[PDB]
Amino acid sequence: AEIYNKDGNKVDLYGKAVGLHYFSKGGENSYGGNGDMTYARLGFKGETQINSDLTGYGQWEYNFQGNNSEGADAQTGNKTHLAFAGLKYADVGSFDYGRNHGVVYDALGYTDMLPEFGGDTAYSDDFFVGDVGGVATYRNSNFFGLVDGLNFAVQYLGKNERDTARRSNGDGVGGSISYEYEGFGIVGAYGAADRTNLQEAQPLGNGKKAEQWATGLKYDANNIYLAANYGETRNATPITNKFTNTSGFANKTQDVLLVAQYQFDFGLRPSIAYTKSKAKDVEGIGDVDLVNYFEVGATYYFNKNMSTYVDYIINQIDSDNKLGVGSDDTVAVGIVYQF
Amino acid sequence: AEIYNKDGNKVDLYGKAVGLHYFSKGGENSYGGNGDMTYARLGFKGETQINSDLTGYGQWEYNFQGNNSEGADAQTGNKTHLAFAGLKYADVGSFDYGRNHGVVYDALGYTDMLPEFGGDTAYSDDFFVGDVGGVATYRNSNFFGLVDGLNFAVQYLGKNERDTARRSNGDGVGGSISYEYEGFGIVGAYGAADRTNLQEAQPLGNGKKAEQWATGLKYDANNIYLAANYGETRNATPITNKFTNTSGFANKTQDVLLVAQYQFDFGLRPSIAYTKSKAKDVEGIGDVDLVNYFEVGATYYFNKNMSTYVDYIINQIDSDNKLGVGSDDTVAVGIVYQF
Amino acid sequence: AEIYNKDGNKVDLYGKAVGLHYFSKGGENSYGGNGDMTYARLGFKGETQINSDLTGYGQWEYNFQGNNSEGADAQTGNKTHLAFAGLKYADVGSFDYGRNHGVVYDALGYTDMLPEFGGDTAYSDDFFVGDVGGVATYRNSNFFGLVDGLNFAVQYLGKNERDTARRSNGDGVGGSISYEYEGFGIVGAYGAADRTNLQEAQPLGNGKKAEQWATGLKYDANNIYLAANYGETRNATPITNKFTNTSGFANKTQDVLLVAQYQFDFGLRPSIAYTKSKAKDVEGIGDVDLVNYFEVGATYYFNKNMSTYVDYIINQIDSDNKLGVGSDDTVAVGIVYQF
Ligand SMILES: [Mn+2]
Ligand SMILES: [Mn+2]
Ligand SMILES: [Mn+2]
């Protein structure tokens, strides 16, 4: 919804209301939980033509949970998703700064396409893999305008010394390179950052640097969407041990995500996917699967404003998992109005 | 404020800023309290024409309190009022899901018309009587298009197992039927739900099912608004005992609400009302009035964007009330800008 | 961004996304701190022409911090900046009520012009000097339309009995008078209010009334902005003692703020400023500087939507300060998209 378009400046207001319910047995031992998961999003996205070569931009988006009471829990799960501003010049590149996606998400975004679930390794506030505060990101499209389809990025992660180790990080650098051709896309991305003293002080995890990288392929054409990600992390993936009630990072993980989807012209978009994340070298445990499931699902698009969906997670995690990770299935049912 | 209207999709942004002050003696023993009560609302309401018979819709509304400091109390009273999405077909009905009004509010809305106060039994997060998370609601207008003025609804309340008993509920079903003719409206509505284990574990209240029903009449025509509600609840109305510092639900209540109002063409709308809510079978007490007052008030509408109002509550609750319910009067003064 | 303009009613939606980073040594002993300071603003401002002499209005603005994780700290620093509604008549005056600027801010606003910092004595939730809840404000423009450039205001501060003494206040009255001529402006403003029992009970500070006043001059013309404020407070300025971990108000302060700025036509706006705030009669200390710095800074305006800035605070506070006030420098770097 364009609310302003005079000369230089264009502003869009956008939002959505998501009626959403999760069904699981009982559901504290399930993949996704059980009960109402309704939420809403509001945001703006703006762009100003400063001169013939230079554009300025900003974006903001907030999440308002709709599954809280109006009492003490009213704000649970509310947060800023995105908040950044930047500048883009000609065929030189773009620079933005704020709360934005980590550069490894350039790869992980390939498989973050499921109706409701998926994208399990793109954790928020986790270095370079998901949403993260205080990133400066340089992006180049079409390699200075010389090589069509060839993009790269360089990202500096500023340190965020927060109260919890889960949500903190030290200074870091990361980058990504991407090539797209005839409906395919190839991507690789890598970042390394320091860990904070509060992260080192955690039982689970040990080392001075956190590292994350991932590669991916996608195909996105002729009504088909197929993608695969591979990734490895060092001291970056957050974990909990529900037996020892302790927490930290995984010394190492290996991550695989696959998705295949077809879009029928009358609106139905079935989805199948697989996701497997395994950790290693975990103080008091050894090797343990963090995520392991098959997904079968569908979205029905009535048009670009209205959709409904069912997302079924066949959870392959075992009831004996050493970290306590839930092993039951979850199915989501969603109805979405957006503008 | 329509911010988009192209072909299928219409989106309205709406909001208001309410400068509001409550005057009571001292005011911890008063009906409404004392001090600044300023707040603001923002929302969106959208509608998409999917085909000739089928429309999609969404609505979201948030409350931002304006009577908090910017310190630790900044978010007190902030919350999502509404957040839902749905579909409406032809002369078959509508279905929506999310945070929405309980179906008994179809009746109680009849008397929830006072400038500031009123609607005292339409508690939020209380089964079917007010705002509630995780409801699916089927609505039929004009009985499949066969009987003009005859509407009904069926609502399934999904369970919300929250940290407090006050804000929780179990699975439930409810319905309402309504008939309107020559400026009158007749309504009845009933819902029953299970209570959670955390609700059963509360001192005040006992039983496995919560029930709420209400009937109402209104007249709304020739510049007059007159309405009456009657209702009864079992194990549903929340209560506190300020002597024993305990809390729970009332085993039973009986509720009466009356309102009469006249709208002068130059803008003044005087209001008088009566509200009485009495509980029964309360562990350690017996019978006790929850609400008991006369209201005299007026709104002045300058136009549809700007209004001012005074709302006087003559509180008939006694200083000896057994639950500690406040007995002093309260008067509100409000100035409202909305769009 | 005007989202509605039909006949009587005009509504603007406004907002901004501020990518912002503070650099200080380490930075718990610095002026501004260290790390990401990204935030966003959203608001609306509306105005209705009720008749030829009478206009109605409302404004709301919220601050959403973008430097929080999505965990427990998600809402830190979020708040309502402004929330009020009012009426303006002909050449009689305006009246509004809500969360608005204290009338002493009529003076202090003169020097609150720095790219990022500055305006250090316009504390929020501090009687009349900054943002404050529950104020009713009468304003007269051009002295009933008789004396061009001559404005005054009268403000009644309603009592806000909050959980902390820092954020509370008692009933109070304040006023301001202002004269503008040939690019100059002269202002004086005074307010006095009662303190609450919780404020009296604080170690630092003693007395039954809080008082704040300030005068100022500005020049704002020919691309130059020059301003000076002087102010004195009694029992109003909040203070902390980081040695004794105690808090309260200063028995007295004296405040000086100066700013000079030049706006080049191609967009660069350099700024220099000085700010000094000194307290007196502080239980267990005597005299101590609260603020003391030089500022050198610049904004580059690409256009009215996009800007960038650097703001350098040369902090003159000493490492031995008796209240523990930080003594290190801070520099901010900001990139701003607004509409
Ligand atoms: Mn994201
Ligand atoms: Mn409601
Ligand atoms: Mn302000």
GROMACS .gro file of N, CA and C in nm, chain B residues 78-164:
model
  261
  417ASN      N    1  -0.053  -0.177   2.756
  417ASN     CA    2  -0.045  -0.192   2.611
  417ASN      C    3  -0.090  -0.332   2.576
  418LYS      N    4  -0.155  -0.347   2.459
  418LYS     CA    5  -0.198  -0.480   2.418
  418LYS      C    6  -0.266  -0.478   2.283
  419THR      N    7  -0.276  -0.598   2.225
  419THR     CA    8  -0.361  -0.623   2.110
  419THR      C    9  -0.504  -0.634   2.154
  420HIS      N   10  -0.591  -0.548   2.099
  420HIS     CA   11  -0.734  -0.561   2.119
  420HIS      C   12  -0.790  -0.670   2.027
  421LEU      N   13  -0.760  -0.663   1.896
  421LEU     CA   14  -0.818  -0.750   1.794
  421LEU      C   15  -0.708  -0.793   1.698
  422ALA      N   16  -0.716  -0.917   1.649
  422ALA     CA   17  -0.623  -0.967   1.549
  422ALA      C   18  -0.680  -1.093   1.488
  423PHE      N   19  -0.741  -1.083   1.370
  423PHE     CA   20  -0.808  -1.198   1.313
  423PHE      C   21  -0.811  -1.183   1.162
  424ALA      N   22  -0.836  -1.297   1.097
  424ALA     CA   23  -0.855  -1.302   0.953
  424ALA      C   24  -0.967  -1.401   0.923
  425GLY      N   25  -1.036  -1.379   0.813
  425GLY     CA   26  -1.146  -1.466   0.777
  425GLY      C   27  -1.184  -1.457   0.630
  426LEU      N   28  -1.292  -1.529   0.600
  426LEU     CA   29  -1.349  -1.546   0.467
  426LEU      C   30  -1.501  -1.537   0.481
  427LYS      N   31  -1.567  -1.473   0.385
  427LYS     CA   32  -1.712  -1.461   0.382
  427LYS      C   33  -1.759  -1.506   0.245
  428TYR      N   34  -1.855  -1.599   0.241
  428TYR     CA   35  -1.908  -1.649   0.114
  428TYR      C   36  -2.056  -1.612   0.099
  429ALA      N   37  -2.089  -1.537  -0.008
  429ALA     CA   38  -2.223  -1.526  -0.066
  429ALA      C   39  -2.331  -1.516   0.040
  430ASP      N   40  -2.417  -1.619   0.049
  430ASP     CA   41  -2.522  -1.623   0.149
  430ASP      C   42  -2.506  -1.753   0.227
  431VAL      N   43  -2.380  -1.790   0.253
  431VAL     CA   44  -2.349  -1.912   0.327
  431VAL      C   45  -2.301  -1.876   0.466
  432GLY      N   46  -2.227  -1.764   0.476
  432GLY     CA   47  -2.171  -1.725   0.604
  432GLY      C   48  -2.026  -1.678   0.594
  433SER      N   49  -1.974  -1.644   0.711
  433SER     CA   50  -1.839  -1.596   0.728
  433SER      C   51  -1.771  -1.685   0.831
  434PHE      N   52  -1.639  -1.698   0.817
  434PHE     CA   53  -1.556  -1.768   0.915
  434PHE      C   54  -1.430  -1.684   0.938
  435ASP      N   55  -1.400  -1.655   1.064
  435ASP     CA   56  -1.276  -1.588   1.099
  435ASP      C   57  -1.219  -1.654   1.224
  436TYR      N   58  -1.090  -1.631   1.248
  436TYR     CA   59  -1.014  -1.694   1.354
  436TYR      C   60  -0.910  -1.594   1.403
  437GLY      N   61  -0.894  -1.585   1.535
  437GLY     CA   62  -0.792  -1.502   1.595
  437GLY      C   63  -0.838  -1.448   1.730
  438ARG      N   64  -0.787  -1.328   1.764
  438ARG     CA   65  -0.828  -1.260   1.885
  438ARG      C   66  -0.946  -1.171   1.845
  439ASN      N   67  -1.063  -1.202   1.901
  439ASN     CA   68  -1.187  -1.143   1.857
  439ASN      C   69  -1.284  -1.144   1.975
  440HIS      N   70  -1.403  -1.088   1.952
  440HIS     CA   71  -1.504  -1.083   2.056
  440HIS      C   72  -1.571  -1.220   2.073
  441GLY      N   73  -1.580  -1.261   2.199
  441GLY     CA   74  -1.666  -1.373   2.237
  441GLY      C   75  -1.810  -1.353   2.191
  442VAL      N   76  -1.877  -1.466   2.162
  442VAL     CA   77  -2.010  -1.461   2.102
  442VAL      C   78  -2.117  -1.408   2.199
  443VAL      N   79  -2.093  -1.414   2.329
  443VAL     CA   80  -2.187  -1.360   2.424
  443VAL      C   81  -2.182  -1.207   2.417
  444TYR      N   82  -2.069  -1.152   2.369
  444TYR     CA   83  -2.056  -1.009   2.347
  444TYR      C   84  -2.155  -0.964   2.240
  445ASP      N   85  -2.203  -1.056   2.155
  445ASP     CA   86  -2.312  -1.023   2.063
  445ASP      C   87  -2.433  -0.966   2.138
  446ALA      N   88  -2.456  -1.013   2.263
  446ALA     CA   89  -2.562  -0.964   2.347
  446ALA      C   90  -2.514  -0.845   2.428
  447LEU      N   91  -2.401  -0.861   2.500
  447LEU     CA   92  -2.352  -0.758   2.591
  447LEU      C   93  -2.316  -0.628   2.520
  448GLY      N   94  -2.285  -0.632   2.389
  448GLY     CA   95  -2.252  -0.512   2.315
  448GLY      C   96  -2.368  -0.413   2.313
  449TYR      N   97  -2.492  -0.463   2.334
  449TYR     CA   98  -2.612  -0.381   2.332
  449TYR      C   99  -2.602  -0.262   2.428
  450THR      N  100  -2.545  -0.282   2.547
  450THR     CA  101  -2.540  -0.179   2.651
  450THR      C  102  -2.400  -0.120   2.672
  451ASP      N  103  -2.299  -0.168   2.598
  451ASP     CA  104  -2.162  -0.118   2.603
  451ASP      C  105  -2.150   0.007   2.516
  452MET      N  106  -2.217   0.115   2.559
  452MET     CA  107  -2.237   0.232   2.478
  452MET      C  108  -2.209   0.360   2.557
  453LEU      N  109  -2.153   0.349   2.677
  453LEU     CA  110  -2.138   0.467   2.760
  453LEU      C  111  -2.017   0.545   2.712
  454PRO      N  112  -2.008   0.678   2.742
  454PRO     CA  113  -1.897   0.759   2.693
  454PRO      C  114  -1.761   0.698   2.725
  455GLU      N  115  -1.746   0.650   2.849
  455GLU     CA  116  -1.619   0.600   2.900
  455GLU      C  117  -1.638   0.467   2.971
  456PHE      N  118  -1.738   0.458   3.061
  456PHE     CA  119  -1.750   0.341   3.147
  456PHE      C  120  -1.847   0.240   3.084
  457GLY      N  121  -1.919   0.164   3.168
  457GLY     CA  122  -2.018   0.070   3.116
  457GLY      C  123  -1.952  -0.059   3.070
  458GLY      N  124  -2.035  -0.150   3.018
  458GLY     CA  125  -1.991  -0.278   2.969
  458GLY      C  126  -1.906  -0.355   3.069
  459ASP      N  127  -1.939  -0.343   3.197
  459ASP     CA  128  -1.857  -0.395   3.306
  459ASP      C  129  -1.851  -0.547   3.308
  460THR      N  130  -1.949  -0.616   3.246
  460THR     CA  131  -1.945  -0.762   3.253
  460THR      C  132  -1.882  -0.822   3.127
  461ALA      N  133  -1.843  -0.739   3.029
  461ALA     CA  134  -1.773  -0.786   2.911
  461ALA      C  135  -1.623  -0.788   2.937
  462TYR      N  136  -1.582  -0.867   3.036
  462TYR     CA  137  -1.444  -0.882   3.077
  462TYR      C  138  -1.362  -0.937   2.960
  463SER      N  139  -1.235  -0.893   2.952
  463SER     CA  140  -1.140  -0.942   2.851
  463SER      C  141  -1.081  -1.076   2.898
  464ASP      N  142  -1.054  -1.168   2.807
  464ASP     CA  143  -0.991  -1.295   2.844
  464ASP      C  144  -1.077  -1.367   2.949
  465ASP      N  145  -1.206  -1.382   2.916
  465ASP     CA  146  -1.308  -1.439   3.003
  465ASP      C  147  -1.412  -1.515   2.919
  466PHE      N  148  -1.366  -1.621   2.853
  466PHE     CA  149  -1.450  -1.709   2.775
  466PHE      C  150  -1.513  -1.627   2.664
  467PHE      N  151  -1.645  -1.603   2.673
  467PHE     CA  152  -1.725  -1.560   2.560
  467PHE      C  153  -1.778  -1.417   2.577
  468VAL      N  154  -1.743  -1.348   2.685
  468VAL     CA  155  -1.814  -1.224   2.713
  468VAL      C  156  -1.741  -1.101   2.660
  469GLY      N  157  -1.614  -1.113   2.623
  469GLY     CA  158  -1.539  -0.997   2.579
  469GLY      C  159  -1.432  -1.035   2.477
  470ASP      N  160  -1.321  -0.962   2.481
  470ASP     CA  161  -1.209  -0.989   2.393
  470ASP      C  162  -1.150  -1.122   2.434
  471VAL      N  163  -1.115  -1.207   2.337
  471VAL     CA  164  -1.059  -1.334   2.377
  471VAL      C  165  -0.972  -1.389   2.264
  472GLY      N  166  -0.861  -1.449   2.303
  472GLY     CA  167  -0.770  -1.508   2.206
  472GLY      C  168  -0.816  -1.647   2.162
  473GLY      N  169  -0.789  -1.677   2.036
  473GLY     CA  170  -0.800  -1.812   1.982
  473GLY      C  171  -0.945  -1.855   1.965
  474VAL      N  172  -1.030  -1.768   1.908
  474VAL     CA  173  -1.167  -1.805   1.875
  474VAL      C  174  -1.186  -1.816   1.725
  475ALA      N  175  -1.260  -1.920   1.688
  475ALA     CA  176  -1.307  -1.939   1.553
  475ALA      C  177  -1.456  -1.910   1.557
  476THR      N  178  -1.502  -1.828   1.464
  476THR     CA  179  -1.638  -1.779   1.470
  476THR      C  180  -1.697  -1.792   1.331
  477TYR      N  181  -1.810  -1.864   1.328
  477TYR     CA  182  -1.897  -1.877   1.211
  477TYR      C  183  -2.013  -1.780   1.230
  478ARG      N  184  -2.040  -1.698   1.129
  478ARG     CA  185  -2.149  -1.603   1.134
  478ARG      C  186  -2.235  -1.615   1.008
  479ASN      N  187  -2.366  -1.607   1.031
  479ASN     CA  188  -2.463  -1.610   0.923
  479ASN      C  189  -2.550  -1.485   0.930
  480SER      N  190  -2.552  -1.413   0.819
  480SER     CA  191  -2.631  -1.293   0.806
  480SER      C  192  -2.761  -1.321   0.728
  481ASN      N  193  -2.875  -1.283   0.785
  481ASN     CA  194  -3.004  -1.290   0.719
  481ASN      C  195  -3.041  -1.435   0.690
  482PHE      N  196  -2.998  -1.528   0.776
  482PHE     CA  197  -3.030  -1.670   0.769
  482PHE      C  198  -3.020  -1.721   0.625
  483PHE      N  199  -2.896  -1.731   0.577
  483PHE     CA  200  -2.863  -1.779   0.444
  483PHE      C  201  -2.928  -1.691   0.338
  484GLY      N  202  -2.960  -1.566   0.375
  484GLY     CA  203  -3.029  -1.473   0.286
  484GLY      C  204  -3.179  -1.503   0.270
  485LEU      N  205  -3.238  -1.583   0.361
  485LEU     CA  206  -3.379  -1.618   0.351
  485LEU      C  207  -3.467  -1.533   0.445
  486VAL      N  208  -3.417  -1.498   0.564
  486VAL     CA  209  -3.495  -1.424   0.661
  486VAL      C  210  -3.422  -1.295   0.696
  487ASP      N  211  -3.471  -1.185   0.641
  487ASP     CA  212  -3.407  -1.055   0.658
  487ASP      C  213  -3.411  -1.015   0.807
  488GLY      N  214  -3.295  -0.975   0.860
  488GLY     CA  215  -3.281  -0.930   0.998
  488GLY      C  216  -3.244  -1.041   1.097
  489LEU      N  217  -3.234  -1.167   1.049
  489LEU     CA  218  -3.215  -1.281   1.137
  489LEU      C  219  -3.073  -1.335   1.122
  490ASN      N  220  -2.994  -1.322   1.229
  490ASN     CA  221  -2.854  -1.358   1.222
  490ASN      C  222  -2.829  -1.460   1.331
  491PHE      N  223  -2.732  -1.549   1.308
  491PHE     CA  224  -2.683  -1.630   1.418
  491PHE      C  225  -2.532  -1.646   1.402
  492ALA      N  226  -2.471  -1.701   1.505
  492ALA     CA  227  -2.328  -1.725   1.509
  492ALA      C  228  -2.302  -1.853   1.584
  493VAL      N  229  -2.193  -1.920   1.546
  493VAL     CA  230  -2.142  -2.033   1.623
  493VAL      C  231  -1.994  -2.010   1.643
  494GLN      N  232  -1.949  -2.028   1.766
  494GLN     CA  233  -1.812  -1.997   1.799
  494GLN      C  234  -1.749  -2.114   1.874
  495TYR      N  235  -1.627  -2.151   1.833
  495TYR     CA  236  -1.549  -2.250   1.902
  495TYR      C  237  -1.435  -2.175   1.970
  496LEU      N  238  -1.425  -2.190   2.102
  496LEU     CA  239  -1.321  -2.128   2.179
  496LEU      C  240  -1.212  -2.231   2.199
  497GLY      N  241  -1.095  -2.203   2.143
  497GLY     CA  242  -0.983  -2.290   2.169
  497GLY      C  243  -0.924  -2.259   2.305
  498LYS      N  244  -0.869  -2.363   2.366
  498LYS     CA  245  -0.810  -2.355   2.498
  498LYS      C  246  -0.685  -2.270   2.494
  499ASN      N  247  -0.670  -2.189   2.599
  499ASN     CA  248  -0.557  -2.103   2.622
  499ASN      C  249  -0.510  -2.130   2.763
  500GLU      N  250  -0.406  -2.214   2.774
  500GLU     CA  251  -0.345  -2.248   2.901
  500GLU      C  252  -0.237  -2.146   2.933
  501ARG      N  253  -0.273  -2.043   3.009
  501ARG     CA  254  -0.182  -1.933   3.040
  501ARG      C  255  -0.133  -1.944   3.184
  502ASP      N  256  -0.042  -1.855   3.223
  502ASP     CA  257   0.022  -1.861   3.353
  502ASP      C  258  -0.074  -1.827   3.466
  503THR      N  259  -0.177  -1.744   3.440
  503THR     CA  260  -0.272  -1.708   3.544
  503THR      C  261  -0.406  -1.772   3.512
   0.00000   0.00000   0.00000
